[PDB]
Structures are given as C-alpha cells and as structure tokens.
C-alpha cells in the first residue's frame, strides 16, 4: 500500500518542523558568546546545518513521492538533493562521532582531553568532517541521473552506473557503494561510538565510586542529550541500513520473494524515519538540553 498522501504529508511536516527547529538551534548556538560556546557547540551547529540543508530539499522529495515518484526538477536538482541526503547522513554520523569522542576524552581521560584539545582544534575537525562527507557523497552526485524508468512517463531520480561500470559490473558497483555507505555511516562511526561509550560507562561506574557531584551533573546533562541524539539516530537510520543490507544480501542468501517484496515495500517508511530524525533533533534539544530550553 502506498498509503495515499501519507508519505508526502509526513515529508512536508518534517520539512516545516525541521526548518523551524534547525533555525532555532542555529540561532541559539550562534547568539551565545564565543567563550560560552563549548567545543560541542560547533558539532551541534554542524548537525543543525546538515539537517537544514536536507529539509531544504525535503519539499522536492515530498513532491516526488506525491506524484507517484515523478521528478519535475531536472537532473541537476536530483543530483543535488541525493547528494544532500548523503551529506546529511555522513555529516550527522560524523558529528555524533565527534561529540562521543569529545565526551570519551572528557570523562575517561580529562588530562588527555585537554592535551587533544590543545593538539587538535574543533575547527580543523569540523572542516575534515565536512570534506570527508562531501567526498564520500560525491559518487551519489556524479552517478545520479533522472530517467523515465519502466517507461511510465514519470521521471525517477536514480543512479546510473554506466559511466564507471558495465552491466555485468553495475551490480558490483551498486553493492560496493551500498556497503561503503553502510560502513562509514553506521558501522565504523558507530563502532567508534560504542567503544567510546563503553569506556565512558566504565568511567561512569568509577564516578559512581569517585569524582565530584556537580561536575557529574554537568556531564549528566551533556552526555544525556548527546546519547539521546545518538540513540535517535540509531533508531531512525537503523531500518534504512538494515533493510538495504538485507536486500543486498538476498542475492547471496537467495531469500523468498515474499521477504524481498516486504523489504521493498517497507523501505519508503524507513526512509521516512531517517528523514524525520532531522526534525526530531530540535525537539530532543529542547526537552533535555536546558541551553536550548532557556532560549
């Protein structure tokens, strides 16, 4: 079932809420004095910028899904929109990784935290983060195109492998790009975050047996908002990566057509949750973080 106009209504709702909330969080992180702006604030602002850039194109995808997957915007805007979804994914996961690593420095080894802050500045980290996101999403921009697949008089924003691969290697390039995206957007960054959080939890038990109450409370607030963001990302993008990885693995495991059809039909809703995460972030910021709550 296509759910009629459920997917475009959801897309437009997340467009509005994400635009407003990301503007609000950008205003909150930018109106504060530079001294009060902590090293995590640049990551907050970069995540907000990624979400804003994605929800800018969200109306285009809402129109796309409203017209039964017809794209009246041209090849360039298909390329740019797909590039921006992927840039949002990589930039968001890298910003969450940066926040988790900044915490892992702060709680686990505060002296090493200060040492690494002196050695590596936040601006360089953010610049490298965005350059890597741009380069890793570049294949999406290069290979994307618009074409009336299935000859249904409907332009569909798909990815063309003919530029770099033949028909017998189109599957190879598709699986490679999917696996690489899954890795550098949900496995390697998330493995880094789970290692950091496991050491953080060991140090948290230590602070259950040591440390100072007030610093522990400040760490409680910051780590709480950060871990809530990480869990929301891990629950909104997990259906996406899980279903697409299962679809790729189906060719190797020879799954029944029922399961393949289930994955194909449920993927749009996984895309919905992955897109809703961007608008979900500002509400999370208001609920837990008092800084955005005060503003």
């Amino acid at each position: 079932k296509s759910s009629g106009a459920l997917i475009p209504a959801i897309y437009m709702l997340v467009f509005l809420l994400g635009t407003t909330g990301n503007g609000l969080v950008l205003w909150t992180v930018f109106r504060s004095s530079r001294e009060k702006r902590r090293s995590a604030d640049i990551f907050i602002a970069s995540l907000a910028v990624a979400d804003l850039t994605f929800v800018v194109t969200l109306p285009l995808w809402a129109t796309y899904t409203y017209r039964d997957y017809d794209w009246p915007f041209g090849t360039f805007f298909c390329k740019l929109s797909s590039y921006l979804i992927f840039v949002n994914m990589y930039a968001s996961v890298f910003c969450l990784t940066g926040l988790s690593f900044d915490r892992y420095l702060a709680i686990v080894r505060p002296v090493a935290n200060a040492r690494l802050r002196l050695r590596v500045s936040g601006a360089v980290a953010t610049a490298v983060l965005w350059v890597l996101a741009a380069l890793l999403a570049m294949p999406v921009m290069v290979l994307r195109t618009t074409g009336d697949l299935e000859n249904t008089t409907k332009v569909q924003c798909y990815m063309d492998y003919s530029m770099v691969a033949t028909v017998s290697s189109e599957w190879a390039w598709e699986v490679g790009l999917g696996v690489s995206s899954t890795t550098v957007g949900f496995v390697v960054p998330f493995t880094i975050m789970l290692t950091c959080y496991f050491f953080i939890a060991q140090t948290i038990a230590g602070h259950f047996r040591k440390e100072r109450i007030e610093g522990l409370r400040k760490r409680r607030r910051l780590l709480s908002i950060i871990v809530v963001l990480v869990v929301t990302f891990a629950l909104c993008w997990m259906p996406y990566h899980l279903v697409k990885t299962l679809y790729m693995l189906g060719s190797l495991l020879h799954w029944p057509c029922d399961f393949d059809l289930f994955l194909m039909n449920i993927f749009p809703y996984c895309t919905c949750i992955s897109y809703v995460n961007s608008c979900l972030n500002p509400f999370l910021y208001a609920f837990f973080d008092p800084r955005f709550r005060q503003a």
Epitope: V140, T152, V167, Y247, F267
Partner: nanobody
Framework: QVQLVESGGGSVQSGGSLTLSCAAS????????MGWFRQAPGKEREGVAL???????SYADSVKGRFTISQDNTKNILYLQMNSLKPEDTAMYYC????????????????????????WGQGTQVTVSS
C-alpha cells in the same frame, strides 16, 4: 549475464490461449527484471509485457489482447499468458532480463530504459492464423 530460454509460440489459430514461458538462470527477482518484447518489422523491439515495481505487469495497450504476467521465483520462469491470439500477435516474441536497480537509490526499479544493454534470448515466431 543471465541465460534466458524462451518457449511456446508458433503457428496457432486466433483465439488460442498460448503460453510463453521464459526460463532463466541466475536472474533472481531481487536482481533482474523479467519482461516480454516482440520485434517490429523495423526491428524496433516493441514491448508487449513488462514487469514494473511501480505498476506491476505493465501491458502495452496496442498489445493488450489477453496478455498476463506471472513470475515464479522457485522455478525462475516468467509466464506470458498471451491468450486470445490477435493478428497483431504474429511476431517473434523475445523475453529480456534488464537488471533490477537497487533499493537504496532507485527504490528497486526495473530500469527498462536500459533494454538495449540487457540480456535477451532467441524468441519464437508466433504466426497467428484465423
């Protein structure tokens, strides 16, 4: 990459319920897309029945007849139940396996625009008589 073996066809009188079973090897449902075409007098390869993720069994209006598409994943044979043999059905009917696109980017579309680069098979000469 896949190997497609067609069947059926031939000189059959009008109104018959001819069944065209296009077998395949390595062309799974999640990898490649079944479809049926027939060669025009100018060898334009006009489609007669294609499999679509958006629609499902997209039949050409001019080649409507009583054509039916049914895909059996277990035996990997696409059936073209082209019943009610029409005078327009007097053509060489070929089946093609155009690689199905991925779920991540194209939403598992069937890429019928790349029928030129797809894998084909030597069809059968349907000769619809009276």
């Amino acid at each position: 990459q896949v190997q497609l073996v067609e069947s059926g066809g031939g000189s059959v009188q009008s109104g018959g319920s001819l069944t065209l079973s296009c077998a395949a090897s390595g062309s799974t449902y999640s990898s490649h897309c079944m479809g049926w075409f027939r060669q025009a007098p100018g060898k334009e390869r006009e489609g007669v029945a294609l499999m679509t993720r958006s629609r499902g069994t997209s039949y050409a209006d001019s080649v409507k007849g009583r054509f039916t598409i049914s895909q059996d994943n277990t035996k990997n044979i696409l059936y073209l139940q082209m019943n009610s043999l029409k005078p327009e059905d007097t053509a060489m009917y070929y089946c093609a396996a155009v690689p199905r696109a991925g779920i991540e980017y194209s939403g598992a579309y069937c890429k019928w625009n790349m029928k030129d680069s797809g894998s084909w098979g030597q069809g059968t000469q349907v000769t619809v008589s009276s």
